[PDB]
Structure formats: C-alpha cells, structure tokens
C-alpha cells in the first residue's frame, strides 16, 4: 500500500445541457452574479458562493462548470445554476449531467531527483527546466497526466472518475519509490 496518504482533489469540471435555448442579454441584464460581453463572446459567465463554483452557459443551451471539489458538489452547483435560469423565466431543466475532469495532488515527504526519472522513463517524461520547472509524465494506465516536482509533490489530471486518480497514484508509487 501507499505511505499512509491518498491524493486530495483540487478541482472539478462538469457539463450539463439545459434543454432549451436562452437569451443571453436578458440573463446578463437580470442576474446579480453574472458577467457577459455579447460583442466578443457567445456565453455568459456566472458564479455562486456555495459551492464556490463558476458556470459558463452558451446560447445553444450547454453549460460548463468548474471550481468544485467533488462531483456531488459540482452536480449540486449545476442544479443551482439550473434553478437560477428557471427563475429568470426560461424553461430550464437539469438533463444529462456529466463530470468531465478533476484535479488531484499528493506529496511523498521526501525529495525526488527528476533527472534520473527522465533518464529512465524517456517514453513518458519531459524535463525542460528552462521552460517549465516541473517534470511532465504522460501515464497510459489510466490515461492520466502526472506532474512531479523536486519536493516530492505530485499532481494528477485528466480523469473522469476519482478511481482513475488513485489508480495512477498507486501505479506511480513503485516507480517513484525506485
């Protein structure tokens, strides 16, 4: 097993389709928590304080949300945005909700020399410190990208489910243990 630590989650990304078309100008007119610029962009930006999240709603009726810590909180916030649209007068409905991504991170309590890792896992490792300090690891099982630093901190992205994050975590555990 791991050294008593399982990665935390940093962000959630999700999408939902509201089932109807919308007038963005009206929504921006009447929403206290929204920002929109019709002359350059085709979606209205809104935020809620709990769960502390943002939503991006197009005129086509699709919606993108970020800022969540967990999938349930993303779903709750998306339902909240759906209610917000409903009270604005549109026939908004909460359909086909789906999580799209989440971010995870962990630390191993000891330093890691990245040069050895790039010298041994060339097929997956990127080491260009002059461009970005962190080492980039393209992991294949699960299809996850891990970002590694000299402090022993590791960051995970690209999963559809949390089990993918933890799976990549214990997959990389023996490699970093070397």
């Amino acid at each position: 097993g791991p050294s008593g630590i399982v990665p935390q989650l940093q962000n959630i990304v999700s999408t939902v389709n509201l089932g109807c078309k919308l007038d963005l100008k009206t929504i921006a007119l009447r929403a206290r928590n929204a920002e929109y610029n019709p002359k350059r962009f085709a979606a209205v930006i809104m935020r809620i304080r709990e769960p502390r999240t943002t939503a991006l709603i197009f005129s086509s009726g699709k919606m993108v949300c970020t800022g969540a810590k967990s999938e349930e909180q993303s779903r709750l916030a998306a339902r909240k945005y759906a209610r917000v649209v409903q009270k604005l007068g549109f026939p908004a409905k909460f359909l086909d909700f789906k999580i799209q991504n989440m971010v995870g991170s962990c630390d191993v309590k000891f330093p890691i020399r990245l040069e050895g890792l790039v010298l041994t896992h060339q097929q997956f490792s990127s080491y260009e410190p002059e461009l970005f300090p962190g080492l980039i690891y393209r992991m294949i099982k699960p299809r996850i990208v891990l970002l590694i630093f000299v402090s022993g901190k590791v960051v995970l992205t690209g999963a559809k489910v949390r089990a993918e994050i933890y799976e990549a975590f214990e997959n990389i555990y023996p490699i970093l243990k070397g």
């Binding site: 040069e115 060339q122 990127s126 080491y127 260009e128 002059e130 461009l131």
Partner: protein
C-alpha cells in the same frame, strides 16, 4: 529542428540564441516547440551541464 539537430550531436546551444534571429518570444516558441516534439515523439537529449559552460566561459 535546427535545435534538436544540435542536441543530437550534443552540440551546446541555448534557447534564446536561436530565438534571437526569429522575432519570436518565449511563450510563442516554447509552446510550439512542445507541440512538434509531442507530435513526432522523437528521442532527444537534454542540455548536459558541462557542455554549455565551455562555450559560455570562453566568450569572456
């Protein structure tokens, strides 16, 4: 491509020395540089520490 060529011959060359001639900027050229390398997946060494110092020190 010229850069990775020199890297194959472990020939020391740095990032801006190329961008000097190309009207480029850090973000533009670095982001693009990553794009082709991941696209082609070709193996290429890093800048080995001692190599660059010879040409750098000799310039004084």
């Amino acid at each position: 491509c010229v850069l990775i060529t020199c890297r194959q011959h472990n020939w020391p060359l740095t990032m801006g020395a190329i961008c000097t001639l190309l009207y480029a900027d850090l973000d533009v050229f670095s982001s693009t540089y990553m794009q082709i390398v991941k696209l082609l997946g070709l193996d290429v060494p890093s800048l080995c520490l001692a190599e660059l110092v010879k040409t750098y020190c000799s310039s004084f």
